[PDB]
Symmetry: C4
Subunit: 388 residues, 4 copies
C-alpha cells in the first residue's frame, strides 16, 4: 500500500446526497448503546468509519447522568464502520475527551487528548501503537479538531489549541509522520481565534474552516503549506456566515480578514469548502440555537467579501429538530476528490430536561454531481420513550 | 478480481431445497433485534448476505410503533451475512425506504432511496463511496426493486418506478458502471405497470418478473438488453398467475401480453423464472391475502398462453401462516447458474393487532438438481409472547 | 490452499488436557444466548469452531418452552469460533434439526436435515452455496452424525440413517465432492443399528464409532474405504462398553461382532478411537443416566474381545453433574494427527423441571503426550437462578 | 511471517502517556459484561489485545456471586482487541484460572492452568491447537504470570510456580517452541519466593520483575538466558520498593540480594524495568492496600542498593480509588522497543461489600519520549448504581 497524496481535482458538485444515518438514540431505548458526543467520520482507502467520544457508559445505565461533568477521564474515542451504531462490541481506540483521526494510506493515526484541564496530555497513536505525546503548552484545555486530520505523502497535519475559550489563545499546527511529531508551526495570519477545525486536502496543501469562539460569527480559515510548514489564516468571505450564534442574514457581515464582532462569542463546530470563487457551506438553521441544519452554495462566497447570493439550498435537518457539531471529510473517487459532511444530532440536556443525559446520533451526506430531491433526517427519537 | 458475466447455462432443477432461516421475530422476544420489512438476499462471489429495510428501531422498544408511518427518514438498509439476524451490531449501509443491491464481481453497488414522497433522492453507492444520485422524475414515490440488481461485465442494471401506484406510472431502467449512471432507458413493450422487479441474469441479458399494481394479477416481464440498452416487456404466460390478489385457479387467465384485469389492483412482490418453455414460480397459497407460500413448475408456463398444468409443487410456508414479499437471487456454481428465492414472513399489523409494530423474518430456498421431501417453515413466533 | 489428506500418524497420547469451555447456561442467566442441543466441534486448517442446533430462540425468552417439541422447522445450525458463546450475532448456517460439518482444506461442507419426519430433506452446502440435496429414503426421520464429517483428498464422507429408532433401519454412507454427492454405499458388515457416528480420519480411510439404539450397549464401528467406497462394520471389542444405558462393568460384554443385548435399547451419542490393540474411549459415569463423564484407555480394548483392563482414567464431569452427547474431532499437528472430544452438558428438562426449556453448554478436551492432573468441569449453572 | 527477536535497543522514555481504558464496570451497569480479574495486555506485531480471566458469568447475573470461590472450573481466558470491553461476543480462548499469553511473530501461545488445587493441569495452546500439557509438580496450586510471556527467535519462556504461597515454593522456567515444551530450568539465584512475573525482552535474554509473597516487600528479579536456559535471580535494588504491603518510604529497604523482611508476607503483582543504572517502576500509592497507582523513575534504582531518589512521578490512579494487579508489556517500534503497562482496577469485594461480586476494569499507559501532563484515570463506576 502507498501513501495518499489526494492529488486529484475536487469533484464538481451540484449539492449533496444522503449517505448514512445511525439512529443511535432511537436504538438506545431498546438496546445497549454508548452515550457519545463530538462524532465524526473518516475513511481509509476502502471504507468509512464513524468516530465519537464516549462518556464511559451506555445510555440506559444510571452512569448516563455523568454528562453533566466536562472532560471526564472515562471518555474514550470509539471507532466503528460507518453505519454500525455504537454497541457494546465497539472498540475504544484511546482515552480522549478531544480527538482527531486520519488514515495516511497505510495506517490510522489517532490524536487523543485526556487528563487535567490545566495540564492535559495529547497521545499520538499510529498503526496500533503509541508513537508520541505532547503536554499542554498554555495550561488551559489543550484541544483539537473533533474531525478528521489530513495526510499527504505520509505527513499528517492537525490543528490544536490551548488557552482561553473567550479571548486570545495559543493555536499550533502539528506535522506528524507515522505518529511522530516532526514539526510544529504557530498559527499565523489574521484569524484571531481557532477551535475545532474542519480540514480537507487541497493538493498540494490542506485547508481548514474553523470556529472562532471569541469575536467572530464568521468562520476562520487556516491554510497549511505541507511543503514548508508555513501557515496563513483569514475568514470566510461569505456574508452568509456559518457560526452559531450569528446575526440575521440581513445584518451579518464578513470582510474576509477580521472577526466580524457580531454575536461573536461562543459558537459551534462547522465546515465549508471553496470551489473557485464560490463556497459550499452548512450551518444550523436557527441563528441562535443548535436547531436545524442547511447547506447551500454562496456565489462568490470564497472570493467576494460579504457576498450573500445563495443557490442550491438543501434542508438536512428541519428547524423543529436539534443539530449540533458538523464537520467535513474527503473521499477519493476514480477521477476526483469528493467532499462529504456529517451532522451531530444532540439529544437530552440542556435542551431536553426530561432526561439527565446528553448524547447524539448522526446523519451523513456526500457531494454529488447528479440530482436529488428534498427531505429532513433528524435524530427521530421520542424523548418521552427514553430512560431518564 | 474480475467482473461477473454470469455466462454459464442455468442449472436444471427438480425443485428447491432449504437454504436459510433467520428466526428474527422469535429472537426479538428475547434480545435486541431490528424492526424490518422488505428483505432480500444477494451474494458476492464467495458468500451470501441478507438485506432489509430497518425502521430505525429494535422491536422491544417503544419506537416500534413507528411502522404505522410510511417511508420514515429513519429507514436504513441493513446488511449482514445470510443467517446472522439483524442484531445491534448490524451495519446500516445507507439511508433507504426503498433499495436494491448487487455485487459486480469486484464491489457492492447499493441503490438507496429516501426523502419526501414528492421529491425523493436515489443515492448510488459503490465500493464504499457515493458515486451518483438522481432525483424523482414524476414526483410520486420514486421506488425500486427491493431485491438484488444484476451486473454483467461491470454494468449493473436496476428497474425504478415513479408515479401512481394505481394507474399509469413512469418506469425507467438504469445502467450503472462503478456507481455511475451511464444510461437510462424508458420502459417499452406491453407491460402496463411495473413495480418491485425480481431480476436475474440470463446471459447475455437480464430478465425481470415484476408486480403490476394496477390492472394485472398476472406478473409483468421486463427484458433488458445489456448490449444496446433496449427494453422489452410483456406478461408471464402461465394461467396459474403469481400475484396476490388474484382469481382462483379455475378462473385465472393470462395471454402473455396484457394485464388480465382480474383482481388487478394491489399486489405483492414476487418472482418466477423461465426454463425453456416451462416456468418455475412461487406465490402465496391464499389468493386474497399474504398467507402461505408455494412453488411449482408450470409446463408450458413460459411459452404457452394460459397454461395451467403444474408439477413439482412444494409448500414453503403452510396456509395457516403469514408470508409477504418474495424475490429471486442467483448463485454461480461450477458449471451452471442456480436460482434461489427468499420469502418475507410478515408479523404484526395489519393482520395481528395485539401489537402496534410490523416486522418480518425470512426463509430462503435454493434450486436443486437432487431430491427432497416436504415441510413448512413459517416465522414461528407466538404473537402472545411479543412485546406490543 | 490444498485438500486435506490427514496423512500423518495418529499422535501417541497419555490422556487428555483441557481445551475449551463455553459456559453457555451460566451466561444465559445474564445475557441473550441461544437455546441449543447436539453441539459439536470441527476445525479448519487454522482454527476450531463450535457448532450446535439452535431452537430458534434465546433462553431468556418465552419461546424457550418450544423444546418440548421435536425437530421443529425453526432449528438452525449455529457456527461460531470455539469459545465464542452462542450470542445474537451468531450465524445460522442452514436450516437443520440434524447436521454434520467438515472442512476439506479448501472450504466448509455442511449437511443439514430439516422438514417433516416422514419426508425430510438433507441439504448439502459447500463453500457458501447449496450444491445438492437428497430426500428421505425410508420415510422415518432421515438423520446424521451430529459431529464432524471427514474429508480426504477432496472427498468428504458422512454417515446417514433413515428408519426405525428401535429396530432395523437403513444406514447409508455418502461420498461428497465439493458439495456434490458422487456415490452412496449401503451399510455392510455386522453392525445392526447405526446412529450418530463419531468419525475420524485413519488414513487412507475413515473410522466411525457410533450408537446402536436397538440391541447393543456396546458401540458399533463403521469402516469406510475412501478408495473404492466399500464399507465394513462391527462392534468395539472392549468389555467396558461405551453406551448409556449399559450393564455394570462386572456384567457387561462385547464380542466385537454382535450387539450384546444388554440394556441395548436407547443410547447416547459417543466416541472412541483405536491405538494399535488398545482403545481410548469416553462414556457417562452413570450406567443408566446421562450424568458425569469419564475417559480412559482400555488395554486390548480394540483387539481383545471383552477386555476390561483400564488405565489412565480421567474424570471430565463428576457424577453429580449432567452430561449428554459427546463426539470426536481431529486436529492436524506438525507431525501427527491429534484426537479431541467435546461433551454436551444438558440442562433443564427432562431432569430439571423447575424450567420449561432444555439447552446445553460444552466442555472440550484434546489429546496430549504430556502430563496432567485432575478436575471436573461441569455446566456450572444454578438452576434456581435461571429464567423458567 | 518471521519470528520476533526483539533485537532493538529499549526506547529512551521520559515517562508514560495514556493508551487505553475499557470502562468495564461502568458498562456492566447497563449491558452484559463479563465478570473478570487478573487482566493483562499483549500485542501481535500489528495490534494489541486485552486478556482477563472470566468467572464464567456476566456481572448483572445472579451467578456473579461465584467470585467468593477461588479458582472455579468455569474460569476461562478471555481475549479481545484492546479497548473492546468483554461483551458476550468475547472469545474464551481456553479454560484457565491462571494464564499467560504471547505472540512469537507467527502465532499466539496461550498457557492455561485449571483443575484441582492439589493436581492442576497447564495446557499449552499454539496457533489454535493444543500442543502440550504439564501436571502439578508440588501439588499446591500450579500457577503462572497473569501477564505476557516473551518469545525470542521462536522460543517462548514463561515462569511458573507450584507450592506454598507463604513459604519456600518450587519455581520453574519453561522454554516452549510452537507450543511444545523443549526445556525446563529450575529457579536459581537469590530470589526466595517468586509469583506472577512481569517479564520483558531484553535482548538477547528475558528479564522479569515478580512478586515475593513470603519475606519481601522488595520485588524479586528473574533473569532468563535464552541461549543456554540458565537462570539467575535477585531483588530490585531500589529502596523505594514496589510491593504492597510495604514499609513507608522513610523506612523501606532493599539490598538487591535478599528479601527485606519488611511486611514481606502477602503482596500484589507488579512491574519495573531497568534503564542503565536507573529504574522505572509502578506501585500502589497506598503502602497497605491496593489503592491508587503511581509511576516514577528511581535514579540508581537498578544498580545502587537502597537508592531512594525519584523523578518523573506520574499519578495513574489517585489514592481515593482502587487499583489491583499491574504488569508490563512490550511493543516494537521502528527503531526501539517500548515498554507499556496496564493497571487492574478492582471493584466489589472485599473492599466494597454492597455487592457480592468482585470484578475489574483496566487502564493502560505506554512509554513516551515526548511530553505529558497530569490526571487520574480510575475505574469510575458508582458502586451504588451496580447490581449486587
Ligand atoms: C425538489 O428538490 C429540489 C432539489 O432540492 C428543489 O430544488 C431546489 O430548490 C431550492 C429552493 O428553491 C433552490 O435553492 C434556492 O436557490 C435560490 C436561487 O435560485 C435562492 O434564492 C434560495 O435561497 C433563498 O431562499 C431560501 C429558502 O428557499 C432561504 O433560506 C434563503 O435565505 C434565500 O432567501 C435557495 O438557495 C435550489 O437551487 C433548488 N435545487 C436545484 C438543483 O434546482 C425543488 O424545489 C424541489 N421541488 C419541490 C416541489 O419540492
Ligand atoms: C415427499 O416429498 C415429495 C417431494 O416434495 C413429494 O412429491 C411431490 O408431490 C407433489 C404433490 O403430489 C407433486 O406435485 C404435484 O404434481 C402433480 C402433477 O403430477 C400436480 O397435479 C399437482 O398439482 C395439483 O395438486 C396440488 C396439491 O398437491 C394443488 O395445489 C395444485 O393446484 C394442483 O391441483 C402437484 O404439483 C410433486 O411433483 C412431487 N415431487 C416429486 C419430485 O415427485 C411426496 O408426495 C412426499 N411424500 C408423501 C408421502 O407425501
Ligand atoms: C493427579 O492426577 C493424575 C492424572 O490424572 C492421577 O493419576 C491417575 O490416577 C488414575 C486413578 O488412579 C489412574 O487411572 C487408573 O489406572 C488403574 C490402572 O493402573 C485402573 O485400575 C483404574 O481404573 C479402576 O479404578 C477407577 C477409579 O480410579 C474405576 O473407575 C475403574 O472402574 C477401575 O476400577 C484407573 O483407570 C491413572 O492412570 C493415573 N494417571 C497417570 C498418568 O498416572 C493422580 O492419581 C492424581 N493424584 C492425586 C493425588 O489426585
Ligand atoms: C504538569 O504535568 C507535568 C508532567 O506530569 C508535571 O511535572 C512533573 O511533576 C512531578 C512532581 O513535581 C515531578 O516528579 C517529581 O520529581 C522530583 C524530583 O525533581 C521528586 O522529588 C518528586 O518525588 C517527591 O515528591 C512526590 C510528590 O510530587 C512524592 O510522591 C515522592 O515520594 C517524593 O517525595 C517527584 O518524583 C516530575 O519530574 C515532573 N515531570 C516533568 C517531566 O517535568 C507538572 O508538575 C504539572 N504541572 C503542574 C502545574 O503541576
Ligand atoms: C444523576 O445525577 C443527577 C444530578 O446531576 C441526579 O439528580 C439529582 O437528584 C437529587 C436527589 O435525587 C436532586 O436533589 C437534584 O435536584 C437532582 N439534580 C438534577 C439537576 O436534577 C440523579 O439523581 C442522578 N441519578 C441517580 C440514579 O442517582
Ligand atoms: C405507539 O403508537 C400508537 C398509535 O399509533 C399508540 O397507541 C395509541 O394510544 C393512544 C393512547 O394510549 C390511544 O388513544 C390510541 O387509540 C392508540 N392508537 C392505536 C391505533 O392503537 C401507542 O400509545 C404508542 N406507544 C406508546 C408507548 O406511546
Ligand atoms: C411454555 O409451554 C408450557 C407447556 O409445554 C406451558 O406450561 C403449561 O401451562 C399451562 C397453563 O399455564 C398448564 O396447565 C400446564 O400444566 C403447563 N405445562 C407444563 C408441562 O408445565 C407454559 O405456560 C408455556 N409458557 C408460557 C409463557 O405460556
Ligand atoms: C450469592 O451468594 C451469597 C453468599 O456467598 C448469598 O448471600 C447469602 O444469602 C443468605 C440468604 O439470603 C444469607 O443468609 C447469607 O448471609 C448471605 N451470605 C453473604 C456472605 O452475604 C446470595 O444470596 C447469593 N445470591 C443469590 C441471589 O442467591
Ligand atoms: C463543544 C461544544 O460547544 O459543544 O465545545 C468545546 C469547547 O468547549 C469549545 O470549543 C470552547 O473551547 C468542547 N471541547 C472541549 C475540549 O471541551 C466540545 O467537547 C464541545 F462541548
Ligand atoms: C409494499 C407492500 O405492498 O407491502 O408496497 C410498496 C408500494 O406501496 C407498492 O408497491 C405500491 O406502489 C412499498 N414501497 C414503497 C416505496 O413504499 C413497499 O415498502 C411495501 F410496503
Ligand atoms: C438424541 C438424544 O437421544 O438426545 O436422539 C436422537 C434420536 O432421537 C435418536 O438417535 C434415535 O433415533 C435425536 N435426533 C433426531 C434427528 O431426532 C437427537 O436430536 C437427540 F435428541
Ligand atoms: C492474586 C491476588 O492476590 O489478588 O493472588 C494469586 C495468588 O493467590 C497469590 O499470588 C498467592 O500465591 C491468585 N492466583 C491464583 C492461582 O489463585 C490470583 O488469582 C490473584 F488472586
Ligand atoms: Ca463565534
Ligand atoms: Ca396486481
Ligand atoms: Ca444402545
Ligand atoms: Ca510481599
Amino acid at each position: 500500500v502507498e501513501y495518499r497524496n489526494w492529488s486529484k481535482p475536487q469533484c464538481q458538485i451540484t449539492g449533496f446526497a444522503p449517505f448514512s444515518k445511525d439512529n443511535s438514540i432511537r436504538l438506545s431505548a431498546g438496546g445497549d448503546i454508548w452515550v457519545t458526543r463530538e462524532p465524526y467520520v473518516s475513511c481509509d482507502p476502502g471504507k468509512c468509519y464513524q468516530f465519537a467520544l464516549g462518556q464511559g457508559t451506555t445510555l440506559d445505565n444510571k452512569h448516563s447522568n455523568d454528562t453533566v461533568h466536562d472532560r471526564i477521564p472515562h471518555r474514550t474515542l470509539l471507532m466503528n464502520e460507518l453505519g454500525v451504531p455504537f454497541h457494546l462490541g465497539t472498540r475504544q481506540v484511546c482515552i480522549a475527551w478531544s480527538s482527531s483521526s486520519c488514515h495516511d494510506g497505510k495506517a490510522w493515526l489517532h490524536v487523543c487528548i485526556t487528563g487535567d484541564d490545566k495540564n492535559a496530555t495529547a497521545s499520538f497513536i499510529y498503526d496500533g501503537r503509541l508513537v508520541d505525546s505532547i503536554g499542554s503548552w498554555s495550561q488551559n484545555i489543550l484541544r483539537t479538531q473533533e474531525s478528521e486530520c489530513v495526510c499527504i505523502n505520509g505527513t499528517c497535519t492537525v490543528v490544536m489549541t490551548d488557552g482561553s475559550a473567550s479571548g486570545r489563545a495559543d493555536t499550533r499546527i502539528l506535522f506528524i509522520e507515522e505518529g511522530k511529531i516532526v514539526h510544529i508551526s504557530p498559527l499565523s495570519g489574521s484569524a484571531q481565534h481557532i477551535e475545532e477545525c474542519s480540514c480537507y486536502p487541497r493538493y498540494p496543501g490542506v485547508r481548514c474552516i474553523c470556529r472562532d469562539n471569541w469575536k467572530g460569527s464568521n468562520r476562520p480559515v487556516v491554510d497549511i503549506n505541507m511543503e514548508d510548514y508555513s501557515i496563513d489564516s483569514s475568514y470566510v468571505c461569505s456574508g452568509l456566515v456559518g457560526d452559531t450564534p450569528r446575526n440575521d442574514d440581513s445584518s451579518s457581515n464578513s470582510n474576509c480578514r477580521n472577526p466580524n464582532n457580531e454575536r461573536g462569542t461562543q459558537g459551534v463546530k462547522g465546515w465549508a469548502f471553496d470551489n473557485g470563487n464560490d463556497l459550499w457551506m452548512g450551518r444550523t438553521i436557527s441563528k441562535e440555537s443548535r436547531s436545524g441544519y442547511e447547506t447551500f452554495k454562496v456565489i462568490g462566497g470564497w472570493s467576494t467579501p460579504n457576498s450573500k447570493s445563495q443557490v442550491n439550498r438543501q434542508v438536512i435537518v428541519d428547524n423543529n429538530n436539534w443539530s449540533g457539531y458538523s464537520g467535513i471529510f474527503s473521499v477519493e473517487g476514480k477521477s476526483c476528490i469528493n467532499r462529504c459532511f456529517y451532522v451531530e444530532l444532540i439529544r437530552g440536556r440542556p435542551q431536553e430536561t426530561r432526561v439527565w443525559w446528553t448524547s447524539n446520533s448522526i446523519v451523513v451526506f456526500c457531494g454529488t454531481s447528479g440530482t436529488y430531491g428534498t427531505g429532513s433526517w433528524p435524530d427521530g427519537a421520542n424523548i418521552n420513550f427514553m430512560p431518564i
